[PDB]
Amino acid sequence: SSWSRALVKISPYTFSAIGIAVAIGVSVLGAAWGIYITGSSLIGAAIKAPRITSKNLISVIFCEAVAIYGVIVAIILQTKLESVPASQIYAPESLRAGYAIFASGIIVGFANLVCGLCVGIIGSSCALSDAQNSSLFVKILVIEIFGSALGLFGVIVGIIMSAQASWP
Amino acid sequence: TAPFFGFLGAAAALVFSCMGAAYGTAKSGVGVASMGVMRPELVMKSIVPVVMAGVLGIYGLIIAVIISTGINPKAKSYYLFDGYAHLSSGLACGLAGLSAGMAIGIVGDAGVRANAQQPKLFVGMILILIFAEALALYGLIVGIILSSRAGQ
Amino acid sequence: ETAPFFGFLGAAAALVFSCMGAAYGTAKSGVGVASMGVMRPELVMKSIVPVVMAGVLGIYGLIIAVIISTGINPKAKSYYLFDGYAHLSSGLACGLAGLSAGMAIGIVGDAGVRANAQQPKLFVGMILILIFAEALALYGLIVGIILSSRAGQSR
Amino acid sequence: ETAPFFGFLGAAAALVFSCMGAAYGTAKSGVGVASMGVMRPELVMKSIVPVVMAGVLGIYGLIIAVIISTGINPKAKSYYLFDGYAHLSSGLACGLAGLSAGMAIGIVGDAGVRANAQQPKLFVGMILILIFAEALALYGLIVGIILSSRAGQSR
Amino acid sequence: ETAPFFGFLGAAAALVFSCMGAAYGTAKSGVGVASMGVMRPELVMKSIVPVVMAGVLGIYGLIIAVIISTGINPKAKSYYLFDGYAHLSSGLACGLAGLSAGMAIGIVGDAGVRANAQQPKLFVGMILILIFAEALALYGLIVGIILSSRAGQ
Amino acid sequence: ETAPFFGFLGAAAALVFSCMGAAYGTAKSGVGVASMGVMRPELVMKSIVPVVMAGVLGIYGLIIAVIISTGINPKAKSYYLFDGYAHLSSGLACGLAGLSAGMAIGIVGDAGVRANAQQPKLFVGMILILIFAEALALYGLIVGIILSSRAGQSR
Amino acid sequence: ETAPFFGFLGAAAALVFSCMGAAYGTAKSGVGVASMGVMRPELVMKSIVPVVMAGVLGIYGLIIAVIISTGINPKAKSYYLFDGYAHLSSGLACGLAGLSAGMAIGIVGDAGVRANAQQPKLFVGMILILIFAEALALYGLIVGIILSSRAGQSR
Amino acid sequence: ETAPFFGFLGAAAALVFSCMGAAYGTAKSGVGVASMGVMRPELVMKSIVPVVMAGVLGIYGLIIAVIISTGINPKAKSYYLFDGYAHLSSGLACGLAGLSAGMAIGIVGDAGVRANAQQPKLFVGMILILIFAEALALYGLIVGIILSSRAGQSRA
Amino acid sequence: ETAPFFGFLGAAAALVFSCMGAAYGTAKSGVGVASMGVMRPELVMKSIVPVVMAGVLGIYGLIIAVIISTGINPKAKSYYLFDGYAHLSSGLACGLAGLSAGMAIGIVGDAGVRANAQQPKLFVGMILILIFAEALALYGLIVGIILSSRAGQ
Amino acid sequence: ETAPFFGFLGAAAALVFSCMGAAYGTAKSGVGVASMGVMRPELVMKSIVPVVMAGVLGIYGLIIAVIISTGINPKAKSYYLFDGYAHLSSGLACGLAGLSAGMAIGIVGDAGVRANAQQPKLFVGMILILIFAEALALYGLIVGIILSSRAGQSR
Amino acid sequence: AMTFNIHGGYLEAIVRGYRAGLLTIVEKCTLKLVDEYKHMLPLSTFLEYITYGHMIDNVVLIVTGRDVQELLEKCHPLGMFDSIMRELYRLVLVDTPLAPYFSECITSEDLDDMNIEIMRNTLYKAYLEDFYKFCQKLGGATAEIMSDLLAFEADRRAVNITINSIGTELTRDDRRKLYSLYPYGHEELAVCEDIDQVRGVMEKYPPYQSIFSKLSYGESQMLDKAFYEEEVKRLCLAFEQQFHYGVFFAYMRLREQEIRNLMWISEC
């Protein structure tokens, strides 16, 4: 009853900051996990030759691109913050803007982390295969490019979602 | 806002479905590595499904972009019923999409094993992958119905 | 309003649960189907069918959501919220029925298709066994949306 | 107002749990029958009976769910809040009894498939054992129906 | 007030829990009986008894639930909290006791299938153990019945 | 007021926990008895003693719970939360003590049955051990009696 | 006021936790004693000490619970939150000490049962460790006495 | 006025956690000693040390509990609200320190009892490790005393 | 109002998370280095990259925490629930990112130690991988610094 | 009103977490030192250092707790919210950092104790690794001290 | 299978590379494989179980009793584990899961492990304990392959028993027990007492079926050679080389098969 009515009220600025920051944090965590998987794969096959190391470097470049996308998203969210006066931080329009920003951050960061984990696993398998067969390198690069394209798609989604806020 | 959060979740659920299908794409690529360890032609054949799976996620991102274009809440006021309907339908679509992505990953692993072996029922493996992609497309289409199901 | 909210929640739960169970069954049966197909291409054609059947059942379960989208009518007169809760219950029941029956069908079809490598007639037997539960899954999923559409009168 | 929503949720629980029990039964029976067919393809037909029993239990659960879904109109029948909750309870109890009966029937069906691999007299005995297990589903459905009728009695 | 709702829910929980415990025990006893029949048809006939003994618990739980459902009536008395709470608690106790007894009966049934496969006096001891488990179930049911009979408020 | 809720809940919990403990003890004792009978059917006769002790402890817990419950008479005394709280505490303590005692006694009885199958004096040793384990049930009964008295001490 | 809900809960919890710990310890000690008796009857006779320790722990827990219950005099003492809080604290301390002592006693009993077969001097020494654990439990009980005595400030 | 409930809870909890840690450490040390038995029966003196450390930890816990109980005097300087929470904080610190010390002491004592049978020349090192471990319990007792000290000033 | 409490909690959580992640990565890397150094002690002396990366992670965490603490100046700015909530969340996200990066980098270095033990080419490759991981950590630190700068407004 | 109480609670939790981490590290180092002493008594003397490091970390945590306790002063200011908040945050951060560093240092020392027995040369590098591990905790303690110095939040 | 990416990737990759690298001389190859395993020292448990079987062999060589130390040294250090007569068998039981069952079967120590027939039962019990240790991997596809191989070994043992050990007076119930989940139950092959009759029933076993085929060499042989073709097939099962799983035991088996092929080639 009373608790149900109370639960509605929330502070939009906290949600906006969470959307600005947690997405970048999760993207960084996913990129780190992918980089760790790639590094383990490279350590496994470092015996033979550094072509697998070059493939892992391409994967790390994809991870760094994901990180740069997260940094750009954070910068945009810093810019995308609405007027949101300290006094006027209770309007329902501010709540709608906060919800939109949180949705943008959730869609961005989670997809970025999933793409990073996928890229890490694919790069590990690709490094193993390249260590196995010398000929198969372009096929590995194809999967790496696919992971990078997934990260870029997430970045583009964040860029589109940048224009969401409606707070006063 | 509660209606804003409901519609946002309605879209982000299909977004998360695509993100989950990215895991099936990763499994397909992992299998494709072993498949191409045998023959580079099999490597290309197995790699193509990974590119298709990534294109599926790109399409999900495009759908999210369309949702962001339509995200403006001034045009339509959503009540408790509307927000609940949107969120529930989106979540159902997202669950269906994640399940389809998992099935697609399993089928991709099986097809990678087949390509590592001789061609054999490569057509059948492609048919199974097509069935998984058709389930994913059915979920994506069902999402549009709920997206358009708004207003008085 | 409360009634359309609950009705739509149940209708979507129908599709979500039915699709989840159907996809779990599809993966289970498809493991054995792929095993049989790798064993011999002759059994591959027969063993391919149950996977397509499970996919079709899942697609039907998903489509039932589109039908149930008209089961609850917010644009129409709002009756007591208990009617919408009844629609919610009907949808949840349909989803759980589809999930359970599809999962069972696929679990059986896993070993059925996997063993079909030995005997080709085992493929026919596994197809029959899988259909015996897939039909129940689809029937329950459809019947739930039907009941959700029907119970909205509220006297 | 508290009555019909609760009772419908109980019908949902009935359908869900009956489906889950039928799912356990069907999955276990199919898994056993897949191995059984390899040994004796002719004996596969005999082992199909537990699958039929599980399907019958699921159909009974679905029928009870449809019956409970019927009567949702407030003017059609008198339903005090405790009466609707009693209908909910009837549905939930019948569904859970069917679920447990279905799981037990599935385990017994796997055992019966193993016994079919053994001397067929053991399979004949396991058939009666499975029938005795399935009787629990009918008992639970009867109890649920009786309690649903008592719930229908209201003021 | 709304307490008879909770009382009916408790009676349903009694029935469901008793049925669940009894059916789990019956499944275990059926697996044991299948093993015995694979071993010796002589053990097959006797091994059927624990399944029926377990199902007796489910039947008793269903009967108790039916009695409790008959207990709730607006004509008998106006809605009140104490009677509904007492009925719900009695049902919960009866159902929990039945489920525990069914699980114990199933474990004892598997052990007794093995014992009957071992020796006949072992089968007699298993029958005695099953009798003890049934006595425990009956004691729980009687306690629940008394608690329901304490329905004055 | 709400005191009967707590009192009835404690009465139910006592019986439930006592039944669970008795079930665990009986299962362990039955496993031990089956092992002894397989080893030596003649020695199996004396092996039933731990099972009898566990059943007696369970019955005593059940009897204490019934006695505590019978004391609750709303017509006898007006609404007082003290009596309900005392009854609930007595039930909870008695049930927990009975459950722990039953589980421990069952484990000890299985071990002692194995040892008695090994050596004869081990039977006397296990009997002494079970007599020691009965102290938990005795303490639970004493605590239940004390709480029942405190229930009447309410004013 | 709310004192019965606190005091009765604490009194029940003390006995419950003490009984559970003592039961687990006695079960471990009984398993070890059965192993020793299978090895040698003399070790079985020697292994009685852990049972005595478990019984002492249970008796201490029961005594603490009895003291706490006797502290409850609502007729003489006005309903204060402090009075119930003191009893609850004493009960919690007693129960936790009993459970810890029971676990330690079970471990020590298994160790000493092994040692008795290993060497009589080892068992004689481990008796000292068991006595030390019992002394720690007694110290906890004594702190419980001070906790109970603190209730005097409330009237 | 509701603070004394929290104070009594903390006072009980300190002793409870200290007893739990001591019991765990003592059980571990006893199992280790019994394992070391027979092989090196002369090492009874060495095996006695971890039990002594566990007893010392238990005694420290009881002392902290007694101090906390003495702190609770509602007759003078009404507890207000800070007294109960301060008592709870002191009790929690004491109990946590006791549990940590007990676990560490049990593990180290098991290791030392294992090392007792072969090359007993490291008895000095084992005793040093045990003393370094018990230093943690001593520091916890000191911290609890320091916390209990500030309780009186909170009255104003 | 309660904004300083939220900001202090966020800064504390940031510091704790960064310290925990650095500790986990350092523990993994040190265990790997100790395992690898058993064969050839000469290669062990070269294995100081784990120490360098652990120190870098710790220094980054400490710097971020100090910067966040400096931002808490009640005399300069009365602050608001919005500003405090933003600063706390930003700091916590920076700390979490640093912790994840450090944990992943330490996990990589654990195998990199054995790789370096195998050959020097694997050593320089692991050095490059650790450099990339440290670059990611520095990017997270810079993001946290920018976020703290935003808290000034 | 009660915020400084929460601050004192956090201060106590700081010492609690620091002691837990130090105890874990000390236990690991003790196991390693026992193994080394079993190997050679000479390595035992050189292996004492990690235990001293863990004790120093614990002493640093205790010192931080004492400083926090000194921070609480009724005469300093009236009931203020920020005093509790800053103190609790500092304590929680310091305790978490100390516990994590202690666990990491314990694992490192456990590895290094075994490593040094085979080869004494790597002990030098192990010392540097442990020094860095302890320096991380020292930096965390300094950061916590900074927050404690941040006391004058109001005026 | 993301657990492989999360942790253990490098060791799995190294094991896979060592496996793919390998496609008197046999002793040298086995020693090289042992050195590779030691350098390496999930899949680790499977490799440990394979080494446990290879050490059960060397322990049965050592439990009996002739330059036994020299014979153990000639064997691979993986087969001849450094950690390691009734006393000899009891010492072998420590650090080797397979040995205690062999000691239990060999009630008379070396006498009950005579190389003629009794050592066959002792090594069968050792292999049963090694299979229990493999089953201690909590299941898996590699566990399924190990169960199939153990069933093949049990069927071969039962076939050899019915062929020759009837003269050795090994009891039919004991021989079936001597011939070991799947290995445990082989009543179909033990139903037929006649050697010619029992050979068909043993070939009817799925591990022996479809692999032995004509079985001019194989099922006719005694000892454990009935499933020789099935062993090569199980080696070809590892030829699938599916990643993200535990196949270190498969790698060791492939290396041993390569060593055996090199020995069979011998000169030219």
Residue B152 and residue G150: Cα distance in Å, rounded?
A: 68
Kindly state whether K204 is in contact with chain I, defined as any CB-CB distance less than 8 angstroms: no
Residue G23, classed as helix, strand or coil, is: helix
Q: Check: CB of residue I112 under 8 Å from CB of residue I129.
A: yes
Alpha helices in chain B (DSSP H): 2-36, 40-69, 80-116, 122-148
The single-letter DSSP state of residue C120 is T
Distance, C-alpha K100 to centroid of its chain: 16
**Residues ≥6 apart with Cβ < 8 Å to K131:** K146, K147, K150, K180, K183
Of D82, D130, D136, the CB nearest to E4: D82
Using a CB-CB cut-off of 8 Å, the residues of chain I touching J143 are 15, 62, 65-66, 69
Distance between the two ends of chain D, CA-based, in angstroms?
13
Report CA I11 to chain centroid distance, whole Å: 14
Of the candidates H5, H27, H59, the beta carbon closest to that of G108 is on H27
Mention every residue, 6+ apart, whose C-beta is less than 8 A from residue C83: C3, C7, C151, C152, C153, C154, D4, D72
Instruction: Kindly give the residue spans of alpha helices, DSSP state H, lying in chain K.
Output: 2-6, 9-21, 25-40, 43-63, 68-74, 86-93, 99-105, 118-135, 141-160, 172-178, 187-191, 195-203, 228-238, 248-265
Find out whether H21 and H103 touch, Cβ atoms under 8 Å: yes
- Tokens for K193? 């007492």
Residue A43 contacts residue I108 (beta carbons within 8 Å):
yes
Quick check: I115 and K10 CB within 8 A?
yes
- List all residues 6 or more positions away from A66 whose beta carbon is below 8 Å from its beta carbon: A27, A30, A31, A112, A115, A116, A151, A154, A155
Interface probe with H: pick from J52, J62, J99, J105, most Cβ of H within 10 Å: J62
Mutate to test the interface with H, among J5, J28, J29 (most CBs of H within 10 A): J5
Which tokens hold the place of A8? 């509605």
Helix ranges (H only) for I3-119 are: 3-37, 41-46, 49-70, 81-118
Taking CB atoms and an 8 Å cutoff, what residues of chain K touch A33? 6
J133, I22: Cβ pair inside 8 Å?
no
**Is F136 in contact with F56 (CB distance < 8 Å)?**
no
Cβ(A80)–Cβ(A162) under 8 Å?
Answer: yes
In sequence order, the 6+-apart residues with CB closer than 8 A to the CB of D105 are D21, D24, D25, D29, D50, D53, D54, D57, D130, D133, D134, D137
CB count within 10 Å of CB G76 equals: 8
Residue of F59, F140, E92, F135 whose CA lies nearest to G13: F140
A-chain residues within 8 Å CB-CB of B19?
110-111, 114-115
Radius of gyration of chain I (CA): 18
Contact D150, E70 (CB under 8 A): yes
Distance CA I35, CA I113 (A): 8
Q: Can you state the angle between helices K25-40 and K248-265, rounded to 10 degrees?
A: 160
Neighbours of chain H (3+ CB pairs under 8 A): G, J
Q: Are J16 and H93 in contact (CB under 8 A)?
A: yes
Q: Is C124 exposed, middle or buried (0-12, 13-18, 19+ CB in 10 A)?
A: middle
Q: Which of J92, J116, J131, J139 to mutate to test the interface with I (most CBs of I within 10 A)?
A: J139
Locus of tokens 């009907």: C90
Closest CA to G29 of G17, G14, G44: G44
Alpha-carbon distance C20 to C6, whole Å?
21
Q: Which two tokens stand for residue F4?
A: 């009967």
Q: Rounded CA gap, K200 and C102, in Å?
A: 42
Q: What CA–CA distance (Å, rounded) separates F31 from F114? A: 10
State the Cα–Cα distance between residues E68 and E145, nearest whole angstrom. Answer: 9
Local structure of residue K165 (DSSP, 8 states): I
Residues in chain I: 153
Q: List CB contacts (< 8 A) between B117 and chain C.
A: 38
In the structure, do chain I and chain F come into contact, i.e. share 3 or more CB pairs under 8 Å? no
Contact assessment for residue A80 and residue A17, using Cβ atoms and an 8 Å cutoff: no
Q: What does the angle CA K163 – CA K164 – CA K166 come to, to the nearest 5 degrees?
A: 95
Q: Record the tokens describing residue A86, joined without a space.
A: 């300290």
Would you state the structure tokens that stand for residue K79, as one six-digit string?
């087969």
Interface test mutation site (partner K, options B23, B28, B30, B115, max chain K beta carbons within 10 A): B30
How many CB atoms sit inside 10 A of residue K70's CB?
9
Of C88, C96, C115, the CB nearest to D34: C115
DSSP K111: G
Nearest-CA residue of chain H relative to G150?
H69
Radius of gyration over alpha carbons of chain A, in Å?
A: 20
- Chain K residue closest in CA terms to A38: K5
The answer to whether the CB atoms of H104 and J44 lie below 8 A apart is no
Q: How many CA atoms, within 13 angstroms, populate the side-chain half-sphere of residue H106?
A: 21
| Cβ–Cβ contact B30 with K under 8 A | yes
Distance between CA atoms of residues E23 and D134, nearest Å = 10
Please report where in the chains the tokens 């003590």 appear, as a residue: F97
Could you say which DSSP state residue E74 is in?
T
What DSSP assignment string belongs to G56-74?
Answer: HHHHHHHHHHHHHHHH--T
Name the DSSP letter for residue I72. Answer: -
**J126 vs I contacts (CB less than 8 Å):** 34
A40 close to I (CB below 8 A): yes
**In 3-state terms, what secondary structure has residue B105?**
helix
User: Within a 13 Å sphere around the CA of B17, how many CA atoms are in the beta-carbon half?
Assistant: 35
DSSP letter (8 states) at residue K211 = T
Locate the chain K residue with the closest alpha carbon to A132. K17
In total, chain C counts a number of residues equal to 155
d(CA D30, CA J53): 63
Distance, in angstroms, between C23 CA and closest chain D CA?
15
Pick the closest to residue H86 from H39, H27, H154 (CA basis): H154
Comparing alpha-carbon positions, the chain C residue that sits nearest to D28 is C108
Question: Does the CB of K240 have a partner CB in chain B at under 8 Å?
Answer: yes
Q: What angle do CA K194, K196, K199 make, to 5 degrees?
A: 100
Contact F72 E150 (CB under 8 A): yes
I47–J125 C-beta distance less than 8 A? yes
Alpha helices in chain C (DSSP H): 2-39, 41-68, 81-115, 121-150
Place of tokens 């029956």: C101
Retrieve residue B144's tokens: 């549009």
| List of chain E residues whose C-beta atoms are within 8 Å of the C-beta of residue F5 | 81-82, 85
CA distance A90 to A10: 8
Give yes or no for a contact between H102 and H21, defined as CB atoms under 8 angstroms apart.
Answer: yes
Closest by Cβ to G41, choosing from F86, F96, F121? F121
Burial class (CB in 10 A: 0-12, 13-18, 19+), A8: exposed
G: neighbours with 3+ CB pairs under 8 Å? F, H
| Shortest distance, CA H57 to any CA of chain G (angstroms) | 10
Contact criterion met (CB < 8 Å) for H108 and J26? yes
Q: Which chains sit next to E, with 3 or more Cβ pairs under 8 A?
A: D, F
- Cα A136–A138–A143 angle (5° rounding)? 105
Query: Using a CB-CB distance cutoff of 8 angstroms, which residues of chain J are in contact with residue H97?
Result: 15-16, 19
B126 touching K, CB under 8 A? no
Chains in contact with chain D (at least 3 beta-carbon pairs closer than 8 A): C, E
Residues G137, G14: Cα–Cα separation, whole Å: 13
Q: How far is CA C106 from the centre of its chain?
A: 11
Contact between D99 and D54 under an 8 Å Cβ cutoff? The reply is no
- The residues, any chain, with a CB within 8 Å of residue H76's CB and separated by 6 or more, are none
Q: Please state, in angstroms and rounded to a whole number, the distance separating the CA atoms of residues A121 and A143.
A: 10
CA H106: distance to chain centroid? 12
- The residue of chain E nearest to residue F35, with distances taken between CA atoms, is E115
Shortest alpha-carbon distance between residue B58 and chain C (Å) = 22
Contact C13, C82 (CB under 8 A): no
Say yes or no for a CB contact (<8 Å) between D155 and E59: no
> DSSP class of residue A133?
-
Neighbours of A9 (CB within 10 A): 8
Whether residue B133 contacts residue B52, with contact meaning beta carbons closer than 8 Å, is answered with yes
Query: Is residue C12 within 8 Å of C89, Cβ to Cβ?
Result: no
Nearest-angstrom CA–CA distance, B52 and B25: 9
How far, rounded to the nearest angstrom, does the alpha carbon of residue J81 sit from its chain's CA centroid?
27
**Alpha carbons G118 and G112: distance in angstroms, whole number:** 9
CA distance F80 to chain G (A): 10
Is G9 within 8 Å of F122 when comparing Cβ atoms?
no
For A84: left if phi > 0, alpha if psi spans -120 to 50, otherwise beta; the answer is left
Residue among H28, H42, H144 nearest H88 (CA): H144
Chains E and F: how many Cβ contacts under 8 Å? 145
Give the experimental resolution in Å: 4.3
Cross-chain CB nearest to I23 (options J111, J136, J150): J136
Q: Residue C74: what are its φ and ψ, rounded to 5°?
A: -60, -35
| Whole-Å CA distances, K26 to K30, K50, K60 | 6, 17, 20
Residue of C6, C100, C112 with shortest CB distance to D19: C100
Q: Which residues of I touch A20 (CB under 8 A)?
A: 86, 89-90, 147
First to last CA, chain E: 13
Tell how far CA E128 is from the center of its chain.
18
Phi-psi category of residue K194: left, alpha or beta, with phi > 0 → left and psi -120 to 50 → alpha: beta
Burial class (CB within 10 angstroms; exposed 0-12, middle 13-18, buried 19+) of K111: exposed
Sequential DSSP letters for A18-86: HHHHHHHHHHHHHHHHHHHHHHHHHHHHTTT-THHHHHHHHHHHHHHHHHHHHHHHHHHHHHH-----S
Cα B107 from Cα B101, distance rounded (Å): 10
Residue of K nearest to A125 (CA): K243
Q: Are B18 and A109 in contact (CB under 8 A)?
A: no
Tokens found for residue A120: 């890490």
CA distance A87 to I81: 10
Q: Are F75 and F4 in contact (CB under 8 A)?
A: no
Nearest CB to D8: which of C89, C94, C108? C89
- Kindly state whether I115 is in contact with chain K, defined as any CB-CB distance less than 8 angstroms: yes
In the structure encoding, which two tokens stand for residue G66, read together? 């009895």
Tokens of I24: 């986990």
Say how many CA atoms lie within 13 Å of A78 toward its Cβ: 21
Are J93 and I2 inside 8 Å of each other by CB? no
Rounded (10°) angle between helices D81-117 and E49-71: 170
Please give the Cα distance from E89 to E95 (Å, whole number): 10
Q: Which two tokens stand for residue G77?
A: 């003492």
Q: How far is I107 from chain A (nearest CA, A)?
A: 7
- Cβ contact (<8 Å) for I111 and K10? yes
What are the Cα distances from residue A147, in Å, to A60, A151, B20, B129?
11, 6, 14, 20
**Assign residue H94 a region: left if phi > 0, alpha if psi is -120 to 50, beta otherwise?**
alpha
